[PDB]
Each structure stands twice: as structure tokens, then as C-alpha cells.
Design an enzyme around this catalytic site. Structure first.
Site, PDB file in Angstrom:
ATOM      1  N   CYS A  61      -0.847 -82.380  37.790  1.00 32.16           N
ATOM      2  CA  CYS A  61      -0.203 -82.773  36.564  1.00 32.16           C
ATOM      3  C   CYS A  61       0.094 -84.248  36.596  1.00 32.16           C
ATOM      4  O   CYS A  61       0.625 -84.738  37.553  1.00 32.16           O
ATOM      5  CB  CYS A  61       1.091 -81.986  36.406  1.00 32.16           C
ATOM      6  SG  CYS A  61       2.204 -82.542  35.127  1.00 32.16           S
ATOM      7  N   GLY A  62      -0.257 -84.956  35.539  1.00 36.31           N
ATOM      8  CA  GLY A  62      -0.066 -86.393  35.504  1.00 36.31           C
ATOM      9  C   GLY A  62       1.395 -86.762  35.334  1.00 36.31           C
ATOM     10  O   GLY A  62       1.861 -87.762  35.881  1.00 36.31           O
ATOM     11  N   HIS A  63       2.120 -85.949  34.574  1.00 38.32           N
ATOM     12  CA  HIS A  63       3.533 -86.179  34.344  1.00 38.32           C
ATOM     13  C   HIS A  63       4.296 -86.148  35.635  1.00 38.32           C
ATOM     14  O   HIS A  63       5.231 -86.950  35.845  1.00 38.32           O
ATOM     15  CB  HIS A  63       4.094 -85.141  33.380  1.00 38.32           C
ATOM     16  CG  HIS A  63       3.493 -85.207  31.996  1.00 38.32           C
ATOM     17  ND1 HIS A  63       3.902 -86.095  31.072  1.00 38.32           N
ATOM     18  CD2 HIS A  63       2.484 -84.455  31.399  1.00 38.32           C
ATOM     19  CE1 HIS A  63       3.194 -85.923  29.940  1.00 38.32           C
ATOM     20  NE2 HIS A  63       2.325 -84.919  30.141  1.00 38.32           N
TER      21      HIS A  63
END
EC number: 5.3.4.1
Length: 469
Positions: A51-53
Site C-alpha cells: 500500500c502506498g499510503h
């Protein structure tokens, strides 16, 4: 001893299974509940490595943890990689990342969701507001006033001994609520300021009676009931609406763009006075697209409003006999409803010309009676909504069913959009709803409560509804 000591036990990994990364506690389904029991203030982040977040958030989460440690704070931060602990994450209904939840005193039943800022400082700040004293100490009247003045709603407890039992319950309730400021005082001048005869509680608000005095035994349960009840104004503009004890709602559809918004609004307000705990008065902006679903659910456009509709949640709908909105007409409608003198309001889209073209027949409010209640037919009807996921999951199966019966002498498969159509004989609150109307059984209706599968339907139908659900 126990509440603070660990005795000799081996429950899970030895090394070198990391215990801490950059001051962040690593938690697994083998060291989760132990962590919650050992730390009265624990923020837990549920993430996934792809996940980039999360990848972005990690270093600030670490920073906040480092700063918290450098201050010798009690508060700790932890994390759970959901990909390797999926049951654990599923346990808290984590769908999507990151999902950050704050646990107080190890209680797993009341986690608070962290939606605030993504910088280390806003993390620490959020946590600092939520930890420590649940109510602010008020030294005098100026402080009290300054506090009630700062918020649309505020709550103050009056206790001689701040460490007494009832004081502690009051503080218990202060912890459970986030959207109201709480304050507490032992100053007898402040008691007088507010006409108290003894230890007690008061809720201040920027509308209506202006104030509400707590009565009865002081407990967390009593206060939470007292507050959630007196917190809303006579006329409310969501989650609290459903939380409510009243199952009868009246809706004024009010475009923010209307002429004389506040006057008509005031007529509504005047009518709300005669029903306090009887009927909940709600207004809503029929211009804002966020509401366009609701509108369609009541069969209204945008130029037809303002308008008023009534709805009992266990569930028919009504509207007033006349088109005039005066305080007096609203009141009269409400009363005529309470007597059972108002008859339900029904709506139907227009009967499409190709309704009977497909194997699954399409019904609307107008031909429904005609087809579903025909004595010569065995009619199996699906009541659904357009935006419903469960209805979408059922669509292919319902079509298969229609397909297998299209040549049947007496059996008819069909469907109706229950957001767009209101019929006398049947009321649907959940979707999809499935209902059978046998032939030569007068107006008997049998509900289908069994498996939704071609198989369950065939068993059911072939047995005349006597075996299924």
C-alpha cells in the site's frame, strides 16, 4: 501483580522475531491481547506492505513514536501487517489500509478510529487530547462560561470531591464522547452560578431550552443516555438519527436555494413543538446531490420541493392531504397520521412496454397487483435496489431461474425496483427481498428464507412453497 506483572510463560516465538521497529511495537495474533492488557493507551496501525499510503506514513508514524519515547510518555504505538495477520485484522473489520485504531485500557470493544492528520505532530496531538483528564477542571465562573460559550453543546459535572465514585463515572462518560467538551468543578461558587442543590450534571446548548439538568443516579450508562438524548435540536439537518429511540420520522425537503428558506423552516420548527418524543423532525437540502438518492426513494424530483413526507421505520410512507405548508397544516397532518386517518402513499415508475419481453418479468407499482395476485399464476418476485451489492450478486442467478421457467404454463418469475415503487400489499426494508404468490391460494404470500441458489429456488417452487426457507 498481574495487572502489571508478567509471570513465567512462553507463548510464542523465540528470537529473532522482532519486538520493536523504530519504537513501534510489532504485534501479531500471538502477542496482541497481551499488549492491550499491558498498555492502557495504545494506537495500532493496520497496514500492508504494498500500500502506498502506508509506505508514505511509516516514517511519520515512527517519528511520532520516537518523540513520544523521548518524553517518557505512557502512550505507545504499534502495528500489524494485515497480510500476515489477516484473521486479526478481520477481527476488527479492517477493509482498506492503513486503518488506525486507538485502544483505551485494553478494551477491544470500543476502539476509536483515527481519521486525523498524517504528520507525526498531529498524531501526537490527537493522542494528547484523548489521554489524561477526561474533563477540564473549572476553577471559577468565568471558566465555566468560557467553556459553554466555546461549543454548540457542552457538559459540566459538579462534584465536591473530584476523586469520588460518581465523579469517576462522570469521567467515564467523558471518555466515551469525543464531540462534546466536558468540564468539571469542585467550586461551590460555580455550583451556585448554576443553581445546583448538590453533586450533579448539566448540559448546555446553543439552541432551544438552552439547558438540560441531569436527574437520577449518576452512572456512565445514565449519562450517556441523558446526553445522546438531549444533544440534538428539535429540528435536525445522520448516525445519531438512526441511533434514536423514535421510529417515526417527518422530512421537510428544503432546497437551500428556495425563497424564504428561514421562514418556511420556521413554520416547520413551530410544528415540531407539539411532538417532542413522538415524532422526529428532519429537514434536508434537496439541491445537494448527496441527497438525490433519498429524493428518489420518496418519488420526488427537485422542482416539486419543498415538500413533506412521513415515514415509520416499522414501514409505510405518507404525505399530507394538502399542498400548503403552514405550521397549522403540518401539525394537522401529524395528528391525522397519529389517528390512523392518513392512508399510505404509493408510487410507481411507468410500465415499460417491454416489461414482459424477457424471461424475468418487470413490475412497477401499477401492474404489480394485476400480475402478482392473479389467481391462475404462481408468481415469484424479487424486490431489489439499483445500488445494492447483494442484489448485484443475485442478478445472474435470478436470470438463470427465469430462463429455466420461461416456458412454464403457470409459473412466473419477476422483479421490482423497491426504491422506485411502493405497493399496498407488500413492504420491503431490506434488499433483496424474495416473495412467492401461489396460484389458487387467494392472496397468500410465502417468504423465501432459504439458500439463494438455482437449487433452493427449484426445490421451493416445485413444492408450491411448502418446502423451502
Amino acid at each position: 501483580h498481574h495487572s502489571s506483572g508478567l509471570e513465567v510463560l512462553f507463548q510464542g516465538p523465540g528470537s529473532d522475531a522482532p519486538e520493536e521497529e523504530d519504537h513501534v511495537l510489532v504485534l501479531r495474533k500471538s502477542n496482541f491481547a497481551e499488549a492491550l492488557a499491558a498498555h492502557k493507551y495504545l494506537l495500532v496501525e493496520f497496514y500492508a506492505p504494498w500500500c502506498g499510503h502506508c509506505k508514505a506514513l511509516a516514517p511519520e508514524y515512527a517519528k511520532a513514536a520516537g518523540k513520544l519515547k523521548a518524553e517518557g510518555s505512557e502512550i505507545r504505538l504499534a502495528k500489524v501487517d494485515a497480510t500476515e495477520e489477516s484473521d486479526l485484522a478481520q477481527q476488527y473489520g479492517v477493509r482498506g489500509y492503513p486503518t488506525i485504531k486507538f485502544f483505551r485500557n485494553g478494551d477491544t470493544a470500543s476502539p476509536k478510529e483515527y481519521t486525523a492528520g498524517r504528520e507525526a505532530d498531529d498524531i501526537v496531538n490527537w493522542l494528547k487530547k484523548r489521554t489524561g483528564p477526561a474533563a477540564t477542571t473549572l476553577p471559577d465562573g468565568a471558566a465555566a462560561e468560557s467553556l459553554v460559550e466555546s461549543s454548540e453543546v457542552a457538559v459540566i459535572g459538579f462534584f465536591k470531591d473530584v476523586e469520588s465514585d460518581s465523579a469517576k463515572q462522570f469521567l467515564q462518560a467523558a471518555e466515551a464522547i469525543d464531540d462534546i467538551p466536558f468540564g468539571i468543578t469542585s467550586n461551590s461558587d460555580v455550583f451556585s452560578k448554576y443553581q445546583l442543590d448538590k453533586d450533579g450534571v448539566v448540559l448546555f446548548k446553543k439552541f432551544d431550552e438552552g439547558r438540560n439538568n441531569f436527574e437520577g443516579e449518576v452512572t456512565k450508562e445514565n449519562l450517556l443516555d441523558f446526553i445522546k438524548h438531549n444533544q440534538l435540536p428539535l429540528v435536525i439537518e445522520a448516525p445519531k438519527i438512526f441511533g434514536g429511540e423514535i421510529k417515526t420520522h417527518i422530512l421537510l425537503f428544503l432546497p437551500k436555494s428556495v425563497s424564504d428558506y428561514d421562514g418556511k423552516l420556521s413554520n416547520f420548527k413551530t410544528a415540531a413543538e407539539s411532538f417532542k418524543g413522538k415524532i422526529l423532525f428532519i429537514f434536508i437540502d434537496s439541491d445537494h446531490t448527496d441527497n438525490q438518492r433519498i429524493l428518489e426513494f420518496f418519488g420526488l424530483k427537485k422542482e416539486e420541493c419543498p415538500a413533506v413526507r412521513l415515514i415509520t421505520l416499522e414501514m409505510t410512507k405518507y404525505k399530507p392531504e394538502s399542498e400548503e405548508l403552514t405550521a397549522e397544516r403540518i401539525t394537522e397532518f401529524c395528528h391525522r397520521f397519529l389517528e390512523g386517518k392518513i392512508k399510505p402513499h404509493l408510487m410507481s415508475q411507468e410500465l415499460p412496454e417491454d416489461w414482459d419481453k424477457q424471461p424475468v418479468k418487470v413490475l412497477v407499482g401499477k401492474n404489480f397487483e394485476d400480475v402478482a395476485f392473479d389467481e391462475k399464476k404462481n408468481v415469484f418476485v424479487e424486490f431489489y435496489a439499483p445500488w445494492c451489492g447483494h442484489c448485484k450478486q443475485l442478478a445472474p442467478i435470478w436470470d438463470k431461474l427465469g430462463e429455466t421457467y420461461k416456458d412454464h404454463e403457470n409459473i412466473v418469475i419477476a422483479k421490482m425496483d423497491s426504491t422506485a415503487n411502493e405497493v399496498e400489499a407488500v413492504k420491503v426494508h431490506s434488499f433483496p427481498t424474495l416473495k412467492f404468490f401461489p396460484a389458487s391460494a387467494d392472496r397468500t404470500v410465502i417468504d423465501y428464507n432459504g439458500e439463494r441458489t438455482l437449487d433452493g429456488f427449484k426445490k421451493f417452487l416445485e413444492s408450491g412453497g411448502q418446502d423451502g426457507a
